[PDB]
Structures are given as structure tokens and as C-alpha cells.
Design a protein around this ligand. Structure first.
Ligand code: CLA
Ligand code: CLA
Ligand code: CLA
Ligand code: CLA
Ligand code: CLA
Ligand code: CLA
Ligand SMILES: CCCCCCCCCCCCCCCCCC(=O)OC[C@H](CO[C@@H]1O[C@H](CO)[C@H](O)[C@H](O)[C@H]1O)OC(=O)CCCCCCCCCCCCCCCCC
Ligand SMILES: CC(=O)O[C@H]1CC(C)(C)C(=C=C/C(C)=C/C=C/C(C)=C/C=C/C=C(C)/C=C/C=C(C)/C=C/[C@@]23O[C@]2(C)C[C@@H](O)CC3(C)C)[C@](C)(O)C1
Ligand code: KC1
Ligand SMILES: CC1=C(C#C/C(C)=C/C=C/C(C)=C/C=C/C=C(C)/C=C/C=C(C)/C=C/[C@@]23O[C@]2(C)C[C@@H](O)CC3(C)C)C(C)(C)C[C@H](O)C1
Ligand SMILES: CC1=C(C#C/C(C)=C/C=C/C(C)=C/C=C/C=C(C)/C=C/C=C(C)/C=C/[C@@]23O[C@]2(C)C[C@@H](O)CC3(C)C)C(C)(C)C[C@H](O)C1
Lengths: 161, 172, 70, 194, 159
């Protein structure tokens, strides 16, 4: 499985802790886990940098309760103030994104193949496909370390940055 | 040599009505022999319905007693008086109506599985989604569902009993 | 059925050997077709019709008390 | 064995095989087995059409005013009280003529679909548009009509009961200081401590 | 692949390369994207230019809200003035136009052919002229519309 995946730095198959002794099912499970983790990390790091670069907090997140976009602090303090059913609906959209199609072993969802199709690598060129997915994986790992470091910085410093 | 015993209660033979079901090959816990006198399909339907209801109810109690409350002045009541304030407010009857629709269709499911008009399994409603394709994975997932359901039944029982006894949030 | 038991019995034959680990469901073997047929009986159907008519009259009297619109 | 596509935990209902909306085969209770499917389809189409016209009327009544003299109330429920008697009689006459000449008097559940080629829901109002097209396209148009009919039935029910709970107009939803609907009046078995 | 847009006075404009990797259906998908973006950008640019010369045409916009056609300003300001129902109807028209015909690859909808025609060729070689004119106008209108966006965003006024 050393020839699978991305390895952008090249020659960088890294089992380090010898995690994969050789089992296709466990490796595919962890590949789905890593690709999902990377997508989540990239999205979260975007939603973490955006409130600071372009503040852009227009209007009330809760017109009835009174929760304003500009009163939720950026970072970890968000999960006390984003409205109750606001968090419920965010969770529900994650549920829709994860439960619309099947992500079980033996299905394309287990490989990360989803219904987004917002890059459409054009199968006639099945060579930029590997580049696109490798870049996605590597960027997901980078934003993975990034987002966990950002959360730790938020916890230690007391605010987002 | 014979009389396959209950792995849970080792001094009582396992009820033959348990054969082919999820919790029989490892526990087989039917000491009173309800499956010997009641249809095991109906018993499994009841067990899974109770487990799912309790698994929802436990997290509902957790949320309600942790401050998770809908954005409404009428919703600012404690869990103990929640099912009097919401009964008078109306939404309890509303939940009753919608769950009654769902349970009427569940009644149709039960009264179609018993006559053989469907190959539906007792707890099955068709929701596959996070369902393994491999049969062993399906069995393990069903066992996880059953164990979580039973654990949450006991957990919700304890939660409501202790909350009524000593009015507190949840850790008590 | 040598032991005298009533018709439509869910009882196993009491003439059995040493203790049997058998499944004997004590619940009536009813049928959905049979239940629907029974609820379609003239007594059942017409008493249900009478109850429905009486309740409809009750609700009309409740929401429109007396003959105010005569 | 076979199970309904819409309800996977219930048997596939028969008598829905060749029909416009039958591919989803949704019939849990099973009025298909009890009643003529032609009558059920005619009733569904008529309900959907009536409720679509009712929905556009309910929405547009407080707008398009009314007959010179009557005050179309913002809440469309009181329009029946504000309607002139002559207008009601004309509406009743028009509905009776339209619905009684459509079936040549065979306007009853026992006699409507007994002649022969009475297509369910085909009153002849612009059926020529379906006379062309190509089967799948015509069935697609009929399915559009059916889905819009069901949507408007549910929507009109919702509009009526919204006007009931709010005791006001349809569009000013959830007025200021709402704090939930008022508890329902009149007694019940639970009102007298059941 | 030097067609359609190859009529440009510049030529087969490929800065940053792209489409050099035999990406034939990527080329067709980018053709669809270019055609759709051009059409919407031309519509937008016309709907920005018209409200100043022969300004907001008289009328009324929202029965209950008392919004007129003269109340709603132009530019990025007008975003938060059309009522929720009005924006719903506009986006519904967008959705109906998008979903009317199949835009999947290989279909006539996969090249901008939706049967609109109106200004169409007489099948006398001017079809390519018309297609290229539409493509060039849309290409220009895209940068024009982005520039007008930036002008409204920075200056604040509709101009
Ligand atoms: C893992 C993904 C993730 C998560 C959990 C959140 C979570 C949150 N975002 Mg967010 N966001 C994300 C990705 C994410 N974002 C991305 C990718 C962007 C770039 C478009 C943004 C841009 C953004 C803005 C501009 C704002 C938020 C805000 C918020 C908070 C209020 C809820 C809301 O309005 O959601 C909005 C969520 C989206 C638009 C993403 C879809 C909430 C804590 C608001 C806030 O007050 O921040 C503290 C706010 O005004 N987000
Ligand atoms: C509503 C409550 C309820 C119901 C109807 C069932 C029903 C069932 N359980 Mg069960 N169970 C429950 C709660 C329930 N469970 C809880 C809370 C626990 C946690 C301790 C368990 C732990 C458990 C084990 C460990 C096993 C079962 C098993 C069974 C099945 C055989 C037992 C039998 O004949 O009926 C039991 C009838 C009742 C419990 C009715 C309640 C009676 C009281 C007076 C049957 C489908 C066995 C199985 O999987 O069979 C295949 C099995 O091995 N159950
Ligand atoms: C057995 C399931 C069950 C039952 C009977 C109840 C019953 C109740 N809940 Mg509850 N709840 C549940 C599960 C359940 N909940 C779960 C799983 C969650 C987590 C999402 C919540 C989150 C929750 C909140 C945040 C609130 C309630 C509230 C209430 C009360 C009013 C009904 C209401 O508005 O619910 C609302 C329930 C939801 C919006 C989520 C339910 C959706 C899942 C799928 C069920 C009532 C006592 C309200 C109340 O008045 O408390 C005093 C309230 O503010 N619940
Ligand atoms: C709302 C008013 C209304 C109006 C305008 C009509 C109009 C009509 N109905 Mg009709 N109908 C109505 C209500 C109405 N109906 C109701 C409420 C019922 C249910 C009881 C029926 C049941 C019905 C049947 C079963 C039939 C009609 C038929 C007809 C048509 C023939 C009438 C004719 O020649 O009579 C001429 C004038 C007559 C004056 C005298 C009628 C008796 C009065 C009351 C004395 C005509 C289009 C017939 C249709 O034939 O096919 C075209 C037919 O067979 N109707
Ligand atoms: C077509 C006739 C008709 C109509 C329009 C209604 C309508 C109504 N009934 Mg009613 N009812 C009817 C027949 C009818 N019922 C019959 C035949 C009986 C039995 C004799 C009842 C017994 C009944 C009771 C005991 C109660 C109502 C109530 C109500 C009201 C609330 C709805 C409800 O609880 O469902 C009623 C339920 C059924 C009809 C199902 C019965 C099986 C509603 C206005 C309730 C009420 O007043 O709440 C404020 C209430 O407490 N009804
Ligand atoms: C991308 C296409 C697009 C979009 C989103 C809009 C959007 C809008 N136009 Mg518009 N418009 C367009 C194309 C477009 N237009 C074209 C092609 C023309 C030329 C016929 C116009 C001519 C036009 C006039 C004359 C007016 C608007 C107005 C408006 C605004 C009020 C809504 C209305 O009455 O619509 C229409 C709204 C922001 C009104 C407005 O707010 O004035 C600036 C107004 O008076 N439009
Ligand atoms: C099992 C759960 C137990 C349910 C509690 C008993 C039910 C009860 O008291 O009914 C009480 C509820 C009504 O409950 C009354 O509702 C009033 C609304 O006007 C009040 O506002 C309060 O909600 C309550 O007094 O009765 C029903 O809803 C029973 C019919 C349920 C039909 C569901 C099938 C849908 C088809
Ligand atoms: C206060 C003040 O004065 O500040 C002002 C500031 C300002 C800016 C003036 C304002 C304004 C006006 C506006 C509305 C400005 C709009 C700007 C827009 C719409 C930007 C969208 C870019 C979309 C892109 C690039 C999509 C790009 C898509 C791409 C690149 C696709 C890229 C592909 O990689 C993908 C996805 C697959 C590849 O295989 C192929 C290719 C094509 C390369 C404000 C906000 O009002 C206020
Ligand atoms: C078209 C369907 C739809 C409607 C019609 C709708 C409407 C309302 N949404 Mg919702 N919503 C989605 C769909 C819809 N929302 C989706 C797909 C998401 C992505 C996850 C999403 C996100 C949030 C968040 C994060 C919050 C939120 C709330 C409210 C709210 C206020 C009620 C009130 O103020 O009484 C109303 C009326 C905010 C809140 O205030 O809840 C109290 C809150 O925080 N929503
Ligand atoms: C085995 C098994 C499982 C399991 C399990 C588990 C965890 C089972 C646990 C079951 C459990 C934990 C059952 C509770 C008993 C507690 C009781 C009865 C309380 C008595 C308390 C009473 C009667 C109250 C007494 C008083 O109130 C009085 C009378 C008045 C007060 O003044 C004084 C006090 C308060 C003292 C899985 C994993 C879930 C599924 C798997 O498949 C099989
Ligand atoms: C057939 C025929 C013809 C015809 C025709 C006609 C008349 C066709 C008409 C079609 C028509 C009239 C279709 C309406 C649909 C209405 C819907 C779907 C309602 C949605 C409403 C919904 C979904 C819900 C609304 C809500 O209100 C609810 C429930 C609660 C409120 O709080 C919130 C809101 C407001 C959101 C020709 C062409 C004239 C001649 C030809 O020869 C024959």
C-alpha cells in the first residue's frame, strides 16, 4: 500500500508506528476517515480564518432570541452562543451530508466518492485525477494540523488568536 | 450433548424461540421464558422500539437538564415539570399525534410481517444507511443496537428515578 | 387430542414425555383478514355507524348549541 | 418478496401498477384493494385541482379586492361571511353545472367509471395538449399536476389552520409577541381531569 | 482545439496553458460554463445600464409591503430591498430555466442549446458568426459586470 495515496514529498510512505501491517479493509476505513477528517479540517479552518480577515457579521443569527452574527466570538466560544436549534440545524446539515448516500465498505462512499462533483476531473484525463485527490489529501492533512493547533491556541490564549 | 443452554442463565435451557436472533448466540437471556409463551417476533419488535425510544429519551433528558432549551419563553421549564408545562402548552399532544401516525404505520408493518406479506425482520423498517453489507457486520451492528438500547433503557429509568427523588441535573 | 379440550385451544397436548423445551405461544391465532371480517359484522358495523352518528350530533350540538340559525 | 418503493417495510400495493403516480407505490392502509382505482384517482385529481385553485384564491383574495361593495377580508376565512348571497348562488350554480355536465349525470361512485372509456380525471379541458407529446412527456405532465395537487391540498389545509391558530391573516405569520399559540378552548376528557 | 473562441483577434488565448492536456470534455464543460456566465453577465450588465438611462419604470413592487419599482435602488444596494417573495420568484425563474432541459454532457443543453433561438441563423454559415458574437459579448460582459460590482462596492453609489 506504499504506492497508494498521495505522498507529495515523494518517498514518504509513513507508517511510523507500523499502523498498517497489511489489511485492505482497515486501510480503506482509515483512508475514508483521513479524507473526511481533512475535508472537515479545511472547512473548519476556513470558517476560522474568515471571521477575522473579512469580519462580515451582518444581521442577527437569531432574529427572535436576539443572537447577532457580531456577538458570537470567533473560535471555541462559539459553542455557547450560536443558538440551540442553530447548532441542531448545523448538526442536521452534517447529517444530510453524511447520510444522503452510502459510506459503507463495498460502496463508493467508503472511498470518499460522493455526489458533490464540483471539480469534475473529466475521466478522459485520468491523470489529473490523482493530482487533484493527492492535493486534496495533503491539504486536508495540513489543515488538520492547522485546525488542531488553532483550537489549542484558542484554548491557551483565551481567544481565537 | 443436548439442550443448548443459555449463556446468560447457565441453569436454564435457551428458549428455541430465540434461535436465529441477534442476542441468542452469545447471551440467550430468557429465564422467565416469555418467548416460550409470546411470539418472539413481537417481543423483538417491542424490545427494539423500547430501546430506540429510551435512547432518544436519555439524550433528551441530558439536553434538557444541561441547559439545551428551545428558544421560547414557554420552554424555560425544568425537565421534571417539562411534561406538565408542555402538556398544557400543546406540543405534547402534537408529538402524540405525529408519533401516533408513525405508530399506526408501525402497526401496519407488524400486521404485515406476521402474515408473511413481507420478509421484514422484527426491528427492520428499511433504514439501511450506516448498515454493513457483510452479514457479520450486519449482525454486529444489530447487536450494538440492541445492547445500546437495553443500556439506555436502564439508564433512562435510573435518570428519571433519581431526578424525581433528588431534583438535580444529571451527574447528581 | 385425547385429553378433552375445548375447540380453538392454544394448549399443547398434556400427554407429553419428560420436560420439553418447546415454544407454545399462548396468544390467540387471530388473522388480519379475520379481524377485518369480524369488524365488518352487521352488529359491529351498525353500532359503529350509530356511535359515529351520535358523536357527530354531539359535536354539532357542542359547537352550535341550540337551533340558533333556524 | 416485493415491497413498496416508498414504504420499504410494507408490501408493494397492487392496483398501482399502471398509473401516473404509481411508481412510488405509496398506499400503506390499502384503499387500492378496497376501492376502484379509477374513482380514487379521479378524487385525488379533483381534490388537487380544487385545492390549487383554492390556494391561489386564498393567497390572492386579500389582494385582488372583491366584488364592488364587499370587503375581501385580509383573513380569507371571513370572505364566506363577506360574500354576497347572489355571488354564493352563482358559485353554487356554476359548480353544479360544471360538475354535473362533466360526467353526463354518472356523477356517483357506483356509476361514474362504469360506461367504458372514462379516463380518470380527464374532463376534456385541454386534453389535446396531451394528445400530442410522447407518452413519457405526457405522463410527466400528469405527474407534475398530481404532485402540485397534493402539495396544494396540504398547503391549503395549512393556510386554513394557520388562520385558525393566529386568528388573523395568512401572510403576517407569527405576529409580534407570539410566544406560541393560545391554548385550545372548549372542554375535553382531559380538561375535566381525565 | 482552436474553434469558436479562436476567432478572437488575439487567437487561441491560452495563458497559464490549460486545455492543453487533450481535455476535450473539460473543453466542452468550460464551453457550457463560458456560455452560461456570458449570458448571465450580459443580462446583469444590461440590467445595470438600463436603470439610469430611462430609469426605474413606473409601477409597484409589493402589494402589502408598499414597495414600488421606484423604491428599490440600483447596484449592490438593491440586494436587500426586493422582498423575500420577490427574490424567491426570481430564483425560481432561475431554477426553472436551469432545470427545464438536461444540461448533462453530450446533450444539446451541454452546448447552450435550449431552444431559445429567437436571434438564430438561417442555416447559411452565419450560425458560427452568431455563436461567436454571443461568446465574445459574454466574455466582455463578465469583466464589465465584475468591474461594476467593484465600483458599487468601493464607491458605494450605483456608479
Ligand atoms: C467545519 C465548518 C464550519 C463550522 C462548524 C462553522 C461554524 C460557524 N460559523 Mg462558519 N464558515 C465556514 C465553515 C464552518 N463554520 C466556512 C468554510 C466559511 C467560509 C465561507 C465560513 C464563514 C462564516 C462567516 C462569515 C460566519 C460564520 C459563522 C459561524 C458560526 C455561527 C453559525 C453560522 O452562521 O454558520 C455559518 C456557516 C457557514 C456559512 C458555512 C457553510 C458557527 C460557529 C458566523 C459567526 O458569527 O462566526 C463566529 C459568521 O458570521 N462562518
Ligand atoms: C420492554 C422491555 C424489553 C422487552 C420486551 C425485551 C424483549 C426481549 N429481550 Mg430484552 N432486555 C431489556 C428489555 C426488554 N427486552 C433490558 C432493559 C435489558 C437489559 C438488562 C435486556 C437484556 C436482554 C438480554 C441480555 C437478552 C434479552 C433478550 C430478549 C428477547 C427474549 C426475552 C423474552 O422472551 O422476552 C423478554 C420480555 C420482557 C423483557 C418483557 C418485560 C417483562 C417485565 C415484567 C426478547 C425479544 C434475549 C435475546 O436476545 O433473545 C434473542 C437476551 O439474551 N434481553
Ligand atoms: C424520547 C424522545 C424525546 C422526548 C419524549 C422529548 C420530550 C421533550 N423535549 Mg426533547 N430532545 C430529545 C428527545 C426527546 N425529547 C433529543 C434526542 C434531543 C436532542 C436533540 C432533545 C432536545 C430538546 C430540547 C433542546 C428541548 C427539548 C424539549 C422537550 C419537551 C418539549 C418537546 C419539544 O419541544 O421537544 C423539542 C425536541 C427537539 C427539538 C429535538 C428532538 C429531535 C429528536 C430526533 C427526537 C419535552 C419534555 C424542550 C423543552 O421544553 O424542554 C423543557 C426543549 O427546549 N428537547
Ligand atoms: C348546483 C346546481 C345544479 C345545477 C345548475 C345542475 C345542472 C345540471 N344537472 Mg345536476 N345535480 C345537482 C346540482 C345542480 N345540477 C346536485 C346537487 C345533484 C346531486 C343530487 C345533481 C345531480 C345530477 C344528476 C344525477 C344529473 C344532473 C344533470 C344535470 C344537467 C341536466 C339538467 C336539466 O336538463 O334539467 C332541466 C331542468 C330541470 C329544471 C328540473 C330539475 C328538477 C327541479 C329541481 C324541479 C344540468 C347541467 C343530469 C346530467 O344529465 O347530464 C347532462 C343528470 O343526469 N344532476
Ligand atoms: C364526524 C364526527 C366528529 C367530529 C367532527 C369530531 C370532532 C372533534 N372531536 Mg369527536 N367524537 C366523535 C366524532 C366526531 N368528533 C365520535 C363518534 C366520538 C365517540 C362517541 C367522539 C368522541 C370525542 C371525545 C371523547 C373528544 C372529542 C374531541 C373532538 C375535537 C378534537 C378532535 C379530537 O379529539 O378527535 C376526537 C377523536 C375521535 C373522533 C376518535 C374516536 C375513535 C374535535 C372538534 C375532543 C375534544 O373536545 O377536544 C377539545 C374530545 O375530548 N370527540
Ligand atoms: C441578472 C439579471 C437581473 C437581475 C438579478 C435584476 C434584478 C433587479 N432589477 Mg433588473 N433588469 C435586467 C436584469 C436583471 N435585473 C435587465 C436585463 C433589464 C433590462 C430590461 C433590467 C431592467 C430593470 C429596471 C428598469 C428596473 C430593474 C430593477 C431591478 C431590481 C428590482 C426587481 C425588479 O423589479 O426586477 C425588474 C432587482 C434588484 C428595478 C430597480 O431596482 O431599479 C434599479 C427597476 O426599476 N431592472
Ligand atoms: C403512550 C404515551 C401515553 C400517552 C398519554 C395518554 C394520551 C393522552 O392523554 O391524550 C391526550 C391528547 C390530547 O391532550 C390534550 O390536548 C389538548 C389540546 O387541545 C391540550 O392542549 C393538552 O394537550 C392535553 O390536555 O389526546 C390525544 O391526542 C389522543 C389521540 C392521539 C391520536 C394519535 C393518532 C394519530 C393518528
Ligand atoms: C467596503 C468596501 O468598499 O469594500 C468593497 C470590496 C468590494 C470587493 C469592491 C465589494 C464588492 C463588490 C462585489 C460583489 C465583488 C464580488 C466579487 C466576486 C463575485 C468574487 C467571486 C469570485 C469567484 C471566483 C473567482 C470563482 C472562481 C472559480 C474558479 C477559479 C474555478 C477554478 C477551477 O479550478 C477548478 C474549480 C477546477 C479546475 O480543474 C479548473 C478551474 C477553472 C481552474 C464589497 C464586498 O461590496 C465591498
Ligand atoms: C429553508 C429551510 C430553512 C428555514 C425556513 C430556516 C429558518 C430558520 N433558521 Mg435555519 N437553516 C437551514 C434551513 C432553514 N432554516 C439550513 C439548511 C441551515 C444550515 C445548517 C440552517 C442553519 C440555521 C442556523 C445556524 C440557525 C437557523 C435558525 C433559523 C431560524 C430562526 C428562528 C427564530 O429566530 O425563531 C429560522 C426561521 C437560527 C435561529 O435563530 O434559530 C432559533 C439559527 O441559529 N438556521
Ligand atoms: C447485562 C446486559 C447489559 C447490562 C446491564 C446493566 C448495566 C444492567 C444494570 C441494571 C440495573 C442497574 C438495574 C438497576 C437496579 C436498581 C434498582 C432496582 C433500584 C432500587 C432502588 C430502590 C428500590 C429505591 C429505594 C429508595 O427509594 C426508596 C425506596 C425511598 C428512598 O427514600 C430511599 C431509596 C432511594 C433508597 C447490557 C450491556 C445493557 C445489555 C447486554 O446485552 C446485557
Ligand atoms: C389545466 C388547464 C389549464 C389550467 C390551469 C390551471 C388553472 C393551472 C393551475 C395550477 C395551479 C393554480 C397550481 C397551484 C399550486 C399551489 C400550490 C402548489 C400551493 C403551494 C403552497 C405551499 C407549498 C405552502 C404555502 C404555505 O401556506 C402554508 C402551507 C403555510 C404558510 O404559513 C406558509 C406558506 C404560505 C409558505 C389551462 C392552461 C388554463 C387551460 C387548459 O386547457 C386546461
Amino acid at each position: 500500500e506504499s504506492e497508494r495515496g498521495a505522498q507529495p514529498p515523494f518517498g514518504f510512505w509513513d507508517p511510523l508506528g507500523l499502523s498498517a501491517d497489511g489489511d485492505v479493509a482497515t486501510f480503506k476505513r482509515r483512508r475514508a476517515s483521513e479524507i473526511k477528517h481533512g475535508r472537515i479540517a479545511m472547512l473548519a479552518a476556513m470558517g476560522y480564518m474568515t471571521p477575522e480577515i473579512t469580519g462580515k457579521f451582518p444581521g442577527y443569527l437569531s432574529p427572535s432570541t436576539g443572537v447577532k452574527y457580531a456577538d458570537i466570538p470567533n473560535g471555541l466560544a462559539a459553542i455557547s452562543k450560536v443558538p440551540v436549534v442553530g447548532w441542531l440545524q448545523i448538526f442536521a446539515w452534517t447529517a444530510v451530508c453524511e447520510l444522503w448516500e452510502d459510506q459503507v465498505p463495498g460502496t463508493p462512499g467508503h472511498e470518499g466518492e460522493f455526489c458533490f462533483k464540483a471539480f469534475k476531473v473529466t475521466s478522459d484525463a485520468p491523470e489529473t485525477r490523482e493530482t487533484k485527490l493527492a492535493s486534496e489529501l495533503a491539504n486536508g492533512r495540513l489543515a488538520m494540523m492547522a485546525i488542531i493547533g488553532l483550537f489549542f491556541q484558542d484554548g491557551l490564549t483565551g481567544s481565537a488568536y | 450433548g443436548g439442550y443448548k443452554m443459555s449463556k446468560a442463565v447457565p441453569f436454564l435451557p435457551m428458549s428455541p424461540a430465540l434461535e436465529g436472533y441477534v442476542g441468542a448466540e452469545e447471551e440467550g437471556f430468557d429465564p422467565m421464558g416469555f418467548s416460550l409463551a409470546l411470539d418472539i417476533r413481537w417481543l423483538r419488535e417491542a424490545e427494539l422500539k423500547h430501546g430506540r425510544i429510551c435512547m432518544l429519551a436519555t439524550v433528551g433528558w441530558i439536553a434538557t437538564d444541561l441547559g439545551m432549551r428551545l428558544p421560547g419563553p414557554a420552554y424555560q421549564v425544568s425537565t421534571l415539570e417539562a411534561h406538565d408545562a408542555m402538556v398544557k402548552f400543546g406540543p405534547m399532544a402534537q408529538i402524540l399525534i405525529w408519533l401516533g401516525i408513525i405508530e399506526v404505520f408501525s402497526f401496519l408493518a407488524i400486521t404485515n410481517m406476521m402474515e408473511g406479506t413481507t420478509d421484514r425482520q422484527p426491528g427492520d423498517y428499511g433504514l439501511r444507511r450506516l448498515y454493513p453489507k457483510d452479514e457479520e457486520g450486519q449482525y454486529e451492528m444489530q447487536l450494538k443496537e440492541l445492547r445500546n438500547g437495553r443500556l439506555a433503557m436502564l439508564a433512562f429509568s435510573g435518570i428519571v428515578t433519581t431526578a424525581v427523588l433528588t431534583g438535580r441535573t444529571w451527574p447528581f | 387430542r385425547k385429553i378433552p379440550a375445548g375447540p380453538y385451544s392454544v394448549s399443547v397436548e398434556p400427554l407429553r414425555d419428560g420436560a420439553t423445551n418447546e415454544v407454545s405461544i399462548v396468544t390467540p391465532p387471530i388473522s388480519s383478514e379475520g379481524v377485518q371480517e369480524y369488524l365488518s359484522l352487521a352488529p359491529v358495523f351498525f353500532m359503529a355507524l350509530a356511535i359515529f352518528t351520535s358523536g357527530f350530533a354531539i359535536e354539532v350540538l357542542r359547537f352550535f348549541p341550540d337551533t340558533r340559525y333556524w | 418478496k416485493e415491497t413498496s418503493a416508498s414504504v420499504p417495510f410494507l408490501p408493494k400495493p397492487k392496483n398501482l401498477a399502471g398509473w401516473v403516480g404509481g411508481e412510488t407505490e405509496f398506499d400503506p392502509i390499502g384503499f387500492s384493494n378496497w376501492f376502484d382505482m379509477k374513482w380514487l384517482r379521479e378524487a385525488e385529481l379533483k381534490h388537487g385541482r380544487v385545492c390549487m385553485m383554492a390556494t391561489v384564491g386564498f393567497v390572492l383574495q386579500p389582494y385582488i379586492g372583491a366584488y364592488p361593495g364587499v370587503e375581501m377580508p385580509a383573513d380569507s376565512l371571513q370572505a364566506v361571511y363577506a360574500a354576497p348571497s347572489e355571488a354564493w348562488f352563482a358559485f353554487i350554480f356554476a359548480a353544479g353545472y360544471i360538475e354535473s355536465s362533466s360526467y353526463n349525470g354518472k356523477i356517483t361512485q357506483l356509476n361514474m367509471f362504469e360506461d367504458s372509456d372514462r379516463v380518470p380525471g380527464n374532463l376534456g379541458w385541454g386534453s389535446t395538449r396531451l394528445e400530442g407529446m410522447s407518452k413519457e412527456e405526457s405522463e410527466l405532465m400528469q405527474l407534475k399536476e398530481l404532485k402540485n395537487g397534493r402539495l396544494a391540498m396540504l398547503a391549503f389545509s395549512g393556510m386554513v389552520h394557520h388562520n385558525i391558530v393566529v386568528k388573523g391573516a395568512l401572510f403576517p405569520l407569527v405576529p409580534d409577541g407570539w410566544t406560541g399559540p393560545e391554548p385550545w378552548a372548549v372542554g375535553s376528557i382531559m380538561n375535566n381531569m381525565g | 482545439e482552436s474553434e469558436l473562441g479562436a476567432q478572437a483577434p488575439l487567437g487561441f488565448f491560452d495563458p497559464l496553458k490549460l486545455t492543453g492536456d487533450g481535455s476535450v470534455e473539460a473543453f466542452k464543460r468550460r464551453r457550457q460554463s463560458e456560455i452560461k456566465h456570458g449570458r448571465i453577465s450580459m443580462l446583469a450588465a444590461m440590467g445595470y445600464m438600463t436603470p439610469e438611462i430611462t430609469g426605474k419604470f413606473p409601477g409597484y413592487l409589493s402589494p402589502s409591503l408598499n414597495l414600488k419599482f421606484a423604491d428599490v435602488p440600483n447596484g449592490l444596494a438593491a440586494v436587500s430591498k426586493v422582498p423575500a417573495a420577490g427574490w424567491a420568484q426570481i430564483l425560481g425563474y432561475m431554477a426553472y430555466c436551469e432545470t427545464s432541459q438536461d444540461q448533462s454532457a453530450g446533450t444539446p443543453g451541454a452546448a447552450g442549446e435550449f431552444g431559445f433561438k429567437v436571434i438564430t441563423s438561417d442555416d447559411d454559415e452565419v450560425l458560427k458568426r452568431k455563436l461567436a458574437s454571443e461568446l465574445a459579448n459574454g466574455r466582455l460582459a463578465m469583466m464589465a459586470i465584475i468591474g461594476m460590482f467593484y465600483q458599487d462596492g468601493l464607491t458605494g453609489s450605483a456608479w
